[PDB]
Design a protein around this ligand. Structure first.
Ligand SMILES: Nc1nc2c(ncn2[C@@H]2O[C@H](COP(=O)(O)OP(=O)(O)O)[C@@H](O)[C@H]2O)c(=O)[nH]1
Ligand SMILES: Nc1nc2c(ncn2[C@@H]2O[C@H](COP(=O)(O)OP(=O)(O)O)[C@@H](O)[C@H]2O)c(=O)[nH]1
Lengths: 306, 306
């Protein structure tokens, strides 16, 4: 039973956890309902953790950094979980848990958010959530974590190559990675350039202006200082009452997103609407039909076949 | 009749236009339906214009710049309309039309977008759309124009004071205003700093990297060069086939936004949902209820009272 599973999860049973996550990842209407009851039971045991999101372009070094950070943390007495929303030395360790990405963005987002509750209830005190680069995936992850970390390249004038614009402003901390080999001095200059842009984007910020750090994830340099900064972010926000405020706001926002997706899905997933979408859009693109009149036809058609 | 009004608008009757806009601004269900028929008739006569959005903080100088730009353009044979989404020398002129902002953002957005169609049909070839600073108002205006212009302050390290973060990335052109009095050299340095950040945000952009210009709207300096740059934006995008692409994409996006707002409004505007919102949100904030379970209760309650 749900009541049994909850007891085994919070008591720390290593076999219960993956079964609980499996229940949460299921989109069968029977499973969703018990999942919701299980999460209700475990919600009071959650929240005692720091949730950190980590993003950056393919090949910037996210997996290398996460592995090195995960070991740094395990050696300091933390229990560390890694999730991906789309590391062999780490996976070995009993105080780590690593899980691959679970359909749509809404769906992977929901499954990830619910899995966080389970991990925290199971005693994990650090949750690292990696993007797979792009969807609206960066925003989704930023909205479920306490501290969002952007990794960039350590090259003057080229740090943000390949990043979706607007992602810089999501970051609580920015890191220039691969500050090694022929790019030690270059990395400092590249960090100073990003710092200059961050001062322009946050010119009179008084609580937290995102720091720009350098790192060599492959040589294991800069991970400790990155975590020191993640802790300082939490301390600063907590002293201002904003750490809890951010979480409460994210939960209310997610509630309304669930309401939105439920009501919009009826229209979007409607086979007949899917059939006529192309032609209705073509008519709009060609100025043969107004957006308002095309919207009305979409709604009428959904309603006739719902 | 709608058929009569359309003939008078496209034939250039100055009395028909404000009546047509009045019909469009009405949210009475009878008016909305004729408005839609009128827009359908005039849609083929629209599109022959450059739509420019203009944003920046209160007091940066938007109204001063728009007045000076509007006169620059009128003197060059254009017919210029000014709309606001929330100038005495300009209002005097027969080849200008100025209209104050029309409920919600969705509502003002819809009325503004429809009014654009009417103005273009009436022979206006430049449409300037001013924000009133913030809502999600900047995004709304950027999504209905061809060229989005951000005005900022001409002070080194303080150009973006008061701007919602993420707004910089909406801009097709950035202008440092008030490059006058004691800030002539400072303005050049402030422009160079923004240019440096723009290079970092757009490091390998090949089609259009947003230029940063200086201006003194109050002394009438820099308006001509601002318009020269707006024309160059259109020429560059047109040569790449992106000018028409942007418009078609905005229209399809607006269509789906209308569908979204129709379906979400049923829930949001429901009196009973409004009544229980506070307590449901409090329960979510306190960890007494899951987002998914709160969403379900919101949907059930809407459905019971719909
Ligand atoms: N020079 C250098 N290479 C790195 C660093 N971190 C990762 N790499 C290399 O970059 C490649 C991609 O790294 P990976 O961690 O898989 O990047 P990911 O795609 O972001 O997860 C691999 O060859 C890594 O060895 C670093 O700090 N310096
Ligand atoms: N020094 C200087 N003042 C300006 C300039 N443009 C506008 N102003 C002044 O700034 C104040 C606000 O200008 P206004 O155009 O109303 O700004 P708005 O709120 O953005 O529409 C007024 O006192 C203007 O005279 C400029 O280029 N230089």
């Amino acid at each position: 039973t749900v009541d049994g599973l909850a007891t085994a999860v919070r008591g720390g049973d290593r076999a219960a956890l993956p079964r609980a996550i499996t229940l949460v990842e299921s989109t069968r209407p029977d499973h969703r309902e018990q999942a919701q009851q299980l999460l209700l039971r475990l919600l009071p045991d959650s929240g005692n953790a720091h949730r950190v999101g980590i993003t950056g372009v393919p090949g910037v070094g996210k997996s290398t950094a996460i592995e090195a950070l995960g070991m740094h943390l395990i050696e300091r007495g933390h229990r560390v979980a890694v999730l991906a929303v789309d590391m062999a030395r780490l996976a070995v360790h009993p105080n780590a848990y690593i899980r691959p990405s679970p359909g749509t963005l809404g769906g992977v987002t929901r499954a990830t958010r619910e899995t966080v509750v389970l991990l925290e209830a199971a005693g994990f005190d650090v949750i690292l959530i990696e993007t797979v680069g792009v969807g609206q995936s960066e925003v989704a992850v930023a909205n479920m974590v306490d501290t969002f970390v952007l990794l960039t390249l350590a090259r003057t004038g080229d740090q943000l190559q390949g990043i979706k614009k607007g992602v810089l402003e999501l970051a609580d901390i920015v890191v220039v990675n691969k500050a090694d080999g022929e790019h030690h001095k270059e990395a400092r200059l590249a960090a100073r350039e990003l710092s200059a842009a961050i001062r322009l984007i946050y010119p009179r910020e008084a609580l937290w202006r995102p720091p720009v750090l350098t790192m060599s994830a492959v040589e294991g340099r800069g991970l400790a200082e990155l975590w020191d900064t993640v802790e300082r972010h939490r301390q600063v926000l907590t002293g201002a009452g904003e750490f809890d405020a951010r979480r409460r706001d994210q939960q209310v926002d997610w509630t309304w997103q669930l309401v939105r997706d439920a009501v919009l899905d009826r229209v979007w997933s409607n086979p007949t609407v899917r059939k006529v979408r192309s032609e209705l859009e073509r008519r709009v693109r060609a100025g043969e039909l107004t957006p308002a009149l095309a919207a009305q036809q979409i709604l009428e058609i959904a309603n006739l076949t719902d």
